[PDB]
Amino acid sequence: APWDIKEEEHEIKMRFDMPGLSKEDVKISVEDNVLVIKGEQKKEDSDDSWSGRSVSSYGTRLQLPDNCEKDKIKAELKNGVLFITIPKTKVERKVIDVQIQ
Amino acid sequence: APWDIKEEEHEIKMRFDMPGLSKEDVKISVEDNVLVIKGEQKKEDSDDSWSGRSVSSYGTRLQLPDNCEKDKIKAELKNGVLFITIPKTKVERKVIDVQIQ
Amino acid sequence: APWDIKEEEHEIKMRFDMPGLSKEDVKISVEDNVLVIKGEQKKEDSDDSWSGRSVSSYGTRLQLPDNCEKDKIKAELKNGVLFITIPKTKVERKVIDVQIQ
Amino acid sequence: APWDIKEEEHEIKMRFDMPGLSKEDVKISVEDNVLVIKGEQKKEDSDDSWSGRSVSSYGTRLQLPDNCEKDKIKAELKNGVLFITIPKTKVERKVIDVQIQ
Amino acid sequence: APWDIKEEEHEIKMRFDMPGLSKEDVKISVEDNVLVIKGEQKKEDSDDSWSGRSVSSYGTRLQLPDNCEKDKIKAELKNGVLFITIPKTKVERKVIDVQIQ
Amino acid sequence: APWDIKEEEHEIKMRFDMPGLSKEDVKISVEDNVLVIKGEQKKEDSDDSWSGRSVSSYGTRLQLPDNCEKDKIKAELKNGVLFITIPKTKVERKVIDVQIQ
Amino acid sequence: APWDIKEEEHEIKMRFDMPGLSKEDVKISVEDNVLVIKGEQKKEDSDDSWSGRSVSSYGTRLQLPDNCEKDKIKAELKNGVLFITIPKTKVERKVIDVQIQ
Amino acid sequence: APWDIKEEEHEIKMRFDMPGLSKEDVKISVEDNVLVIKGEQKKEDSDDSWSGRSVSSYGTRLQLPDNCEKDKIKAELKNGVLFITIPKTKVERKVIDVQIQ
Amino acid sequence: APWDIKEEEHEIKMRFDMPGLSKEDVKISVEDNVLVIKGEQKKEDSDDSWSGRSVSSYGTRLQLPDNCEKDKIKAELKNGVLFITIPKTKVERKVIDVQIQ
Amino acid sequence: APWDIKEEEHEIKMRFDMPGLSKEDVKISVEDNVLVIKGEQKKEDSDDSWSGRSVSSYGTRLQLPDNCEKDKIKAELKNGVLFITIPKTKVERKVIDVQIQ
Amino acid sequence: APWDIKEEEHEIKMRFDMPGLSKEDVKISVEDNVLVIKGEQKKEDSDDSWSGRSVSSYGTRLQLPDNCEKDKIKAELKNGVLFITIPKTKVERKVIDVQIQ
Amino acid sequence: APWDIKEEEHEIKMRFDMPGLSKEDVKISVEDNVLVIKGEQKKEDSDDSWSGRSVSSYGTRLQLPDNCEKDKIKAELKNGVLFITIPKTKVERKVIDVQIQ
């Protein structure tokens, strides 16, 4: 299965995966509320000696409900699998319901 | 015809419809600018004694141009038909046009 | 789910549904063994002031196995939902089975 | 090719095209951050004397990243071709990167 | 609408259209009875500085019923719209009808 | 790109890839000339706490031209990527060509 | 248009059509309530001397609501067009309507 | 070929077929004019010890032109093949033909 | 079958067909080498009193190899079937064959 | 369900089925390792007197992993159902596993 | 690739191909301006002793711009490949261009 | 028709075909039991002077039941048609049949 993206019990979480890609070719970037991921192909630093070299596009968008709180943002890569944990927001301070009468 | 959603001559109006659903299983919820509707199936409180019991999903999104003014928001249900009337906003205080020269 | 039509434990039952349609625009008609339903659009008696006025065709056929016994035929409309209960018949007074030898 | 829409080396640019439409039937309109274009068919002011008169819908949306700065907004029409040049914004004053550890 | 081609009340008329193309890149050619149009892309004489440069094929055939009378043949280009007016012929000097008996 | 399978300049090589799968859930098996791969889902040994858990089938066939020489067979897993290197055979000791005359 | 079949103001009427078929190759047949038409190809009695001889199937079913009254049944063929006029029945001697309460 | 259903030279005949089904799991049932067949799966009385156990639905409808004469109705099963022979009726005591004039 | 168009053993022949159309609404027209047929709908001269009135387009083109010799051109309509017989031409006065060497 | 083909707990088993076909029209044939089945249509030895006579092709291939041991091969036909039981082989006398290091 | 048909630097050229067909079964025919090719199947003069005998249709049309000059027309067949070289014409003695003003 | 491949009355035979390809660009190759054909495009040795030059892939596999006996293998090319005749094998020295009891 390619990816997961969901509000967990307390936060927001993404998870994707990529063969070959090690701890080197990974980058991200933040904005006022926009996250972006940039993975690329460093499958040119050992040797080719091959045919089925894999090359594709990896960077991708994201927007958080509230402006992305930056400090506690965590992420990790293992066995060709990246995943990013990020804090939830504090929505629902006020609401009103039906008066259908 | 399932629904209508439109800016009338003075306000914003939604209208949808649902068999069975009476004045009980209806709920809404507001946000800073987000409306959401939650209807569900209380077709379990009289008796089944049936085969063609109808059950589906009814809640749905909405966003208003300007933050939803809450007081005068009205809505009503009759003959299995929901409809919500909500105040318009006061856009277009300034504009500029072509200077194609 | 649109409709149900079935032999229950003791009788025959139809059930359908229609938004808007109240206790006024409903009619039926019987025959020697043919039932027919005629619903129509009285969505012209309050006001239009609208775009998504719903108008369609509602009348529909039926035939009962035995000629429709007329007295105890019942029906009802609620929350835009029609349903007709009608007596079963007394088939299977005699039968013969295989003699495949 | 119908249109182009892109961030150039320094600004934002749209370009589209329309047969017949001259410097008369063109209009635009601005908002806090919303641009809209309104072209229409003045192919009724010379004469018809024709069959293949062209009539369609031309107005279209746009939103700029930052609220549309209004003064230096330029545009032009030639040979049935419209194009609008508009100032870029000043995003990316701060950023944070991975700490995948 | 792309083009029109028709016998008018007195003559024959074509009309087509092309963004960008001005009074320069247009050419035609005549034959004993064959007309041909050759438009091309001079969208290389101002500057590119662009992505959505439009380039396509424009030349096209035609045959007139009678050999094309050459003198009074007229044509014009405006707002990226070409159109050619050409004299009709003098067919139907004799006819015979049914004798189905 | 999913996989590569090819005769290299001197040997035979397979390469595939699998997210999540680490150095644990991997197995192979040999035969007289048949290779088979068995990967499975050990995504049950850390915790679920998730929705998009990935589970599928991974084992797959192979046959080598000549009976698989077993000693020098190598393979490796990194960044969720498996690949197996295996010795080539020594075909083409004799041949005959056309005599089409 | 191939055919017409309808209850007129007072009776029941069919109309169809067939090239070539003259007053010879036409037949019908009645039943307790079933009508059937049998037209065939007598395009073998003058001469072939041809390629595009037309041959197809023409007979077709019908059932009348009440058993077909036989005497006044009329029909006619002209210009390769058949049409059958037949008496209506006397349905609706009794009816009952809604009691939806 | 699955089945045959036809009026023979003197009667009416059905024939179908079913693997496994022996002389046990077969049943029929008659009505005023309705025949029905009920075969089922007794592939649970010897043992499973298997994977490709076959289970499906076998009962099926029939209506005879005239009310089914019951005595001489015959049927048989052999080599997983059922077939039912039933008496024809005595239709066509009277008829009327065209008067197309 | 709709139509036939063919060179017979000695001439050229067309044949088509049209329900309703009698000996009245038929017309043709000749040219230097162009034949055209014009049938239309006179299904307005008796009465409508109907629903399935048939109306369509019937005129159609033709070109003969050599200019249409006019005198001996024959045609006829019967049972809603038109057919036109026309003289062949006298092609093939000279020819040359391969010299492939 | 048409057929089953599988390695059971101890052997190899096929099972298929055929209406009509009795113990007569069945044949098989063996090879070094190839099995083939030949059923045909002896539905010509009793009488036709029918329309829905069934005729098709029944012979089919098979290959066993190891050369087919011939003695204990069993098979049977009942209720139009064929099935062949055949001995398994003795594979897996030696194996080697990963050394992914 | 099946065929080529093109105006070369000085003439007109066709080229096609056909297995089996030798220098015998080839024919052409000329007209005032129409060329036609007739190849056929003489794959009946040696012996069949075969299954995959090839038989198809080979004759085909052509029209030249100007009436086909007959003398210098050349053609040849080799290795199951035919090709015809034919003289070009002398078009474009006069022309007129745009006056779009 | 592209090819034929079949066991004749005494041997095995292939036949295919290729335009242009003469007695030069043809090659085959044998193995223990594998035949392979290699045709290629020598349509570069006379001249191009063309557009519709044909180039494709021609080599193809084959396996014989028994190891290919090499001496008497024959083949030939004529009129762009290849065909290979090869000796049959001597299968069926022993067999066993049903004992369905």
Residue numbers in the entry:
A (entry chain 11), B (entry chain 8), C (entry chain 12), D (entry chain 5), E (entry chain 10), F (entry chain 7), ...: 127 to 227
Reproduce, without paraphrasing, sentences from the article in which this PDB structure was first reported:
We also determined the structure of the Hsp21 oligomer in the absence of a substrate. Initial refinement produced a tetrahedral reconstruction at 5 Å resolution with uniformly scattered densities displayed in the inner cavity of the tetrahedron. Subsequent refinement by masking out these densities improved the overall resolution of the map to 4.6 Å, resolving a total of twelve identical subunits. Only the densities for the ACD and CTR are visible (except for short stretches of NTRs ), suggesting that the inherently flexible NTRs are confined to the inner cavity to some extent and contribute to the scattered densities. The map permitted the construction of a model of the ACD with seven β strands (denoted as β2- β9, with β6 missing in our structure), in striking contrast to the six-stranded ACD structure identified in the Hsp21-DXPS complex, suggesting that the ACD partly unfolds to peel away the first β strand (β2) during its interaction with DXPS. Comparison of the ACDs between the DXPS-bound and DXPS-free states uncovers major conformational transitions in the core β-sandwich domain accompanying substrate binding, from a natural “twisted” state to an “aligned” state where the two β-sheets are aligned near parallel to each other (middle and right). Oligomerization of Hsp21 is primarily mediated via the dimeric and non-dimeric interfaces. At the dimeric interface, the β5-β7 loop engages in interaction with β-strands 2 and 3 of the opposite ACD through limited hydrogen bonding (middle). The non-dimeric interface, on the other hand, involves binding of the Val181 and Ile183 residues within the conserved IXVXI oligomerization motif in the CTR to the hydrophobic groove of the ACD formed between β4 and β8 strands of the neighboring monomer (right, and c).
